[PDB]
Amino acid sequence: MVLSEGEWQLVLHVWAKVEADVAGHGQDILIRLFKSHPETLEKFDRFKHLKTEAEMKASEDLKKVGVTALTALGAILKKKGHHEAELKPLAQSHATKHKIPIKYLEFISEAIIHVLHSRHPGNFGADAQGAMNKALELFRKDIAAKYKELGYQG
Numbered sequence: 001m002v003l004s005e006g007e008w009q010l011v012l013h014v015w016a017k018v019e020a021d022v023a024g025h026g027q028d029i030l031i032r033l034f035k036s037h038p039e040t041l042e043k044f045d046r047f048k049h050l051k052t053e054a055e056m057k058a059s060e061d062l063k064k065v066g067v068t069a070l071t072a073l074g075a076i077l078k079k080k081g082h083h084e085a086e087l088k089p090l091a092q093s094h095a096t097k098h099k100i101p102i103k104y105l106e107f108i109s110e111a112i113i114h115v116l117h118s119r120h121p122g123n124f125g126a127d128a129q130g131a132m133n134k135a136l137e138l139f140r141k142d143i144a145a146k147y148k149e150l151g152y153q154g
């Protein structure tokens with residue numbers, strides 16, 4: 001699968017708005033993930049004990065983890081599909097150390113889409129959401145292939 005340049009521009013135009021406040025977007029996305037799919041919180045040994053949305057919002061550790069994830073994803077998106085180098089360390093850590101199944105990458109992709117739809121209706125209409133879905137599907141397809149090369153079914 002290959003995105004067109006027009007599709008990449010829709011992706012990068014909404015990402016530019018995320019970048020006004022990466023920390024706040026990361027909080028919203030992780031909280032949505034943990035509320036919609038509580039099993040995913042168990043993978044974060046550093047804050048898996050958090051019990052409520054209020055505790056999640058107050059956690060500086062959770063905020064920093066959200067910034068780190070969205071910054072890595074932004075760098076991938078800006079490569080417009082030419083992301084082989086960026087996926088290597090990420091696939092290795094997520095397959096081998098953190099043990100994150102592809103299904104959980106689907107869950108975080110849904111959380112990203114949900115939050116962008118809520119926060120950015122001016123830059124996240126139907127065509128823009130479809131382009132972002134196609135970019136996240138490409139990311140997950142390529143990471144899944146790397147997982148398999150690395151010895152993890154995912």
Ligand code: HEM
Pocket residue numbers: 040041043044045046065068069070072073089090093094098100104105108
């Ligand atoms: C867009 C998808 C994601 C991106 C770009 C991403 C990126 C990152 C980065 C850059 C790190 C730090 C370096 C590393 O260890 O590789 C990290 C750490 C981590 N990631 Fe992800 N991640 C993603 C999705 C997920 C998901 C869905 C989970 C769990 C359900 C997860 C679990 C973890 C854990 C447990 C750590 C260690 C966190 C800590 O230091 O406390 N990641 N991730």
Ligand SMILES: OC[C@H]1O[C@@](CO)(O[C@H]2O[C@H](CO)[C@@H](O)[C@H](O)[C@H]2O)[C@@H](O)[C@@H]1O
Pocket residue numbers: 068071072075089090
């Ligand atoms: O590059 C591997 C890995 O490191 C992270 C932080 O966990 O990003 C760091 O390295 C990038 C490439 O050199 C820099 O652009 C970035 O500023 C730096 O923090 C992850 O994003 C990435 O997967």
